[PDB]
C-alpha cells in the first residue's frame with residue numbers, strides 16, 4: 001500500500017483527498033488551520049483495515065475555494081461530504097471528524113443518518129450544544145475571543161498571514177500540550193497549504209458563516225435532529241478553544257449508543273498528542289461492535 | 290445640593306453633575322456607565338472640593354457625534370482639557386475609571402500642566418495595553434467582547450434587546466457582590482443606555498481605539514512618561530483586565546507613584562468599597 005493523491009468533483013466543487021487501504025470507507029475530516037496532513041499519524045495504521053480517505057475541505061489546500069461567506073454554511077459543507085461518499089461509489093462511511101471536520105460530521109450524521117455507519121468526534125462540540133450553551137458560558141465566550149476577531153473583513157487575514165504566518169504558527173504552538181510537536185519540515189508543509197490562493201479567507205469564512213454574533217446570541221431555538229448512529233466522542237480535556245461545559249450532558253442530543261473517551265493530559269490536537277491511543281480507540285470502535 | 294449643568298467644550302456640549310467648592314476635582318466614568326457611577330463618592334468628596342462628574346462624549350446627556358473617528362482617544366482627552374478651561378480653571382485633580390482612566394492617562398501624559406494629581410481606578414496604561422495585550426492569551430481571552438464590539442449594528446442589537454438584558458447580565462457577572470445594583474439603579478442605567486445614539490457611541494470607543502489593527506500593530510507606541518503625582522486603585526478580581534497589564538507601572542511614571550490593591554474587589558472598586566476608595570482619594574489630594 002502507498003498513499004495516493006486524488007481529485008473528484010462533488011456537487012459543484014473539485015475536492016482533493018489522499019487515500020490508502022481497502023475495505024469499509026473511512027473518512028477523516030480535518031479542521032482549522034489544518035488539511036488532510038493532520039491525519040499523517042493515523043492514515044497508514046488505519047489503512048491496514050480500511051479504505052482510508054482524508055480530504056481537504058471546501059476552501060482548504062488543494063480543494064476548490066468558492067468566493068463568499070454564504071458558500072461556507074454548514075449545510076453546504078455537510079453536502080460536500082455526502083457528495084464525496086457517493087462519488088467514491090459508496091452508500092455510507094465511517095466518519096471521523098476533528099474541529100470543523102467534527103462539526104460537519106455531527107451535521108452530516110444528524111441530517112443524513114443513512115449515509116453514516118459510525119460517527120467518531122475529536123474535540124468538536126455538538127452544534128446544538130455550542131448554539132445553546134456558548135452565550136451562557138463566560139469561560140467559552142472568553143476562549144472564543146478569536147471567533148469574534150475572525151468576523152472582521154480582511155484584517156484577520158492580514159494579521160494571520162504576515163511574517164510567514166507567524167501569528168498562526170504561535171497560536172498553533174500555544175494550543176499544544178506536547179513539546180516540539182511540529183518539525184521544521186511540518187511547518188514548511190503547513191505554510192505551503194496556508195499560502196494557497198484564497199485558502200485563509202475561505203477557512204475564516206467558516207466562522208463568518210456559522211459562528212457570527214447573530215448565531216451565537218440567537219434567541220431562536222435550533223432545529224437539529226437527534227444522533228441515531230453509534231457515536232464515539234474523543235475529548236482532550238486541556239482544550240484552549242473549547243470549555244468542558246460544551247461536551248458534558250450529550251444525552252439530549254444522542255439517541256443511539258455512545259461513548260466518551262476523555263484524554264485529561266491532551267489538548268485540542270488529541271490525534272497529534274496521543275496518535276496511537278486515538279488510532280486504537282477508532283479501530284476498536286469500528287471492528288468490535 | 291447636586292446640580293446638573295451643560296457646557297460647550299471644543300465642538301461638543303458636555304453634561305455634568307457638580308457639588309462642592311474649592312479645587313476642581315474631575316471624576317471620569319467608563320463603559321457602560323455615566324456620571325452616576327460616582328454616586329457614592331460625589332457627596333463625600335464635595336465636603337472639601339469642587340466635584341465635577343461629566344458624561345463623556347457619546348454618553349447619557351452629552352453630545353453624541355456620529356462616526357467611529359469621532360471617538361479616537363486624542364479627541365476624548367481634548368474634551369477633558371477643554372472641560373477644564375470651560376470651568377474657568379488652569380488644572381484639576383483628575384480621577385478616571387475604565388475608559389475615564391485611559392483618557393486620564395492620555396491627558397496627563399500629553400498635557401501635564403492641566404493635571405494637578407492623577408487617580409486611576411482599574412484602567413490600564415495605554416502603552417501597557419497596546420504593547421502587552423497581543424502577548425497575553427489571558428488578556429486576549431478577557432477581551433473577547435472588544436472583538437465582538439468591532440462588528441457593526443449586531444452588538445448594539447444584542448446588547449439593547451429585551452431591555453438591555455445582555456448588558457445587565459454582563460455587568461452583574463463583573464461584580465464580586467451578587468446584589469450590588471438595585472432595581473431602581475438598573476432602570477436609571479437603562480435610561481442612560483437608551484439615549485438616542487448612546488450605545489453606538491459607547492461601542493465606537495472600542496472600534497476607534499481597540500480595533501485588531503491597533504491591538505496587533507507591530508509599531509511601538511510614542512507615549513510620554515507621567516510627570517505628575519499618581520495614585521492607582523486596583524480591584525484584583527477584574528474580569529476585563531489581566532494583572533499582566535498592571536505590573537511594572539513605575540516604568541511609565543517619572544514622578545511620585547503609589548498603588549493600592551483591593552484583592553477582594555473587581556472592576557467596579559468604587560462601587561464595592563465606596564468608603565475606602567473615597568478615603569484613599571481624599572488622603573492623596575489633601576497630603
Ligand SMILES: C=C(C)[C@@H]1CC[C@]2(C)O[C@@H]2C1
Nearest residue numbers: 099100124125144241242
Ligand atoms: C467552541 C467553539 C465555539 C469552536 C467551534 C468551532 C471550532 C472549529 O470547533 C472549534 C471550537
Ligand SMILES: C=C(C)[C@@H]1CC[C@]2(C)O[C@@H]2C1
Nearest residue numbers: 146167168171172175241
Ligand atoms: C490563530 C488563532 C488566534 C487560534 C488560537 C486558538 C486555536 C484553537 O488554535 C486556533 C488558532
Ligand SMILES: C=C(C)[C@@H]1CC[C@]2(C)O[C@@H]2C1
Nearest residue numbers: 387388413418432529530
Ligand atoms: C484592558 C483592555 C484591553 C480594555 C481597555 C479599555 C477598557 C475600558 O479598560 C477596559 C478593558
Ligand SMILES: C=C(C)[C@@H]1CC[C@]2(C)O[C@@H]2C1
Nearest residue numbers: 434455456459460463529
Ligand atoms: C457587556 C459586556 C460584554 C461587558 C462585559 C465585561 C465588562 C468589563 O463589564 C463590561 C461589559
Ligand SMILES: [Cl-]
Nearest residue numbers: 005036061062
Ligand atoms: Cl497536498
Ligand SMILES: [Cl-]
Nearest residue numbers: 263264265266
Ligand atoms: Cl491523556
Ligand SMILES: [Cl-]
Nearest residue numbers: 293324349350
Ligand atoms: Cl442624568
Ligand SMILES: [Cl-]
Nearest residue numbers: 551552553554
Ligand atoms: Cl478588598
